[PDB]
Amino acid sequence: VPSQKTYQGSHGFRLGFLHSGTAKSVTCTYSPALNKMFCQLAKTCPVQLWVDSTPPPGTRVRAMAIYKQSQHMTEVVRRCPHHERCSDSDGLAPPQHLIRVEGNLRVEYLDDRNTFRHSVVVPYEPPEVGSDCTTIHYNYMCNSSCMGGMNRRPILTIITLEDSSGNLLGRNSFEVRVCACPGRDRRTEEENL
Numbered sequence: 001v002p003s004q005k006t007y008q009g010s011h012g013f014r015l016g017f018l019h020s021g022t023a024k025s026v027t028c029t030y031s032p033a034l035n036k037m038f039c040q041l042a043k044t045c046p047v048q049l050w051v052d053s054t055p056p057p058g059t060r061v062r063a064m065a066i067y068k069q070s071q072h073m074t075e076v077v078r079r080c081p082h083h084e085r086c087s088d089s090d091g092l093a094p095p096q097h098l099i100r101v102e103g104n105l106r107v108e109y110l111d112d113r114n115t116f117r118h119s120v121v122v123p124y125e126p127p128e129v130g131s132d133c134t135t136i137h138y139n140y141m142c143n144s145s146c147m148g149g150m151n152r153r154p155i156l157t158i159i160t161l162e163d164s165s166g167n168l169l170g171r172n173s174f175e176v177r178v179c180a181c182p183g184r185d186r187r188t189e190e191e192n193l
């Protein structure tokens with residue numbers, strides 16, 4: 001199955017997130033204790049790419065989802081039959097892909113010919129002048145509860161840094177939950193310590 005081991009690499013690639021608290025109006029919140037993001041369906045999910053040194057030109061940023069429970073690791077994560085037959089395509093994203101990228105016309109989606117894994121990839125751009133990180137706005141187009149796709153199984157998002165030719169430059173990952181009230185659910189799952 002696809003690797004998830006953290007790999008910071010020669011460019012010291014770390015992921016970062018906004019520190020949004022757990023108020024009820026929050027659309028997306030990340031738990032450092034759980035290394036877990038909670039987000040709402042289809043809402044903007046900013047993910048920060050932090051690098052100790054800028055990767056070469058033509059570098060690409062790939063996102064992929066896998067099931068976290070070993071007994072579901074080989075099953076391909078994808079939207080439920082209800083949501084892929086939905087009318088929410090942006091004209092770029094395949095109707096079956098869980099993860100989309102927003103606000104970037106150079107986005108590319110892949111169905112692996114041999115693994116069938118889904119992924120979405122964008123060009124890597126360096127941080128905005130006067131900033132320390134590059135931000136990508138991901139969207140999760142299917143709830144963790146969709147009794148038809150994820151069916152309440154936790155998933156991992158694997159963020160991979162690769163050169164123009166697809167060689168791995170770096171890898172990080174975070175657990176994700178797509179729920180109606182991210183703030184409530186984060187506070188509750190941390191109530192479990």
Ligand SMILES: [Zn+2]
Nearest residue numbers: 080083142146
């Ligand atoms: Zn769904």
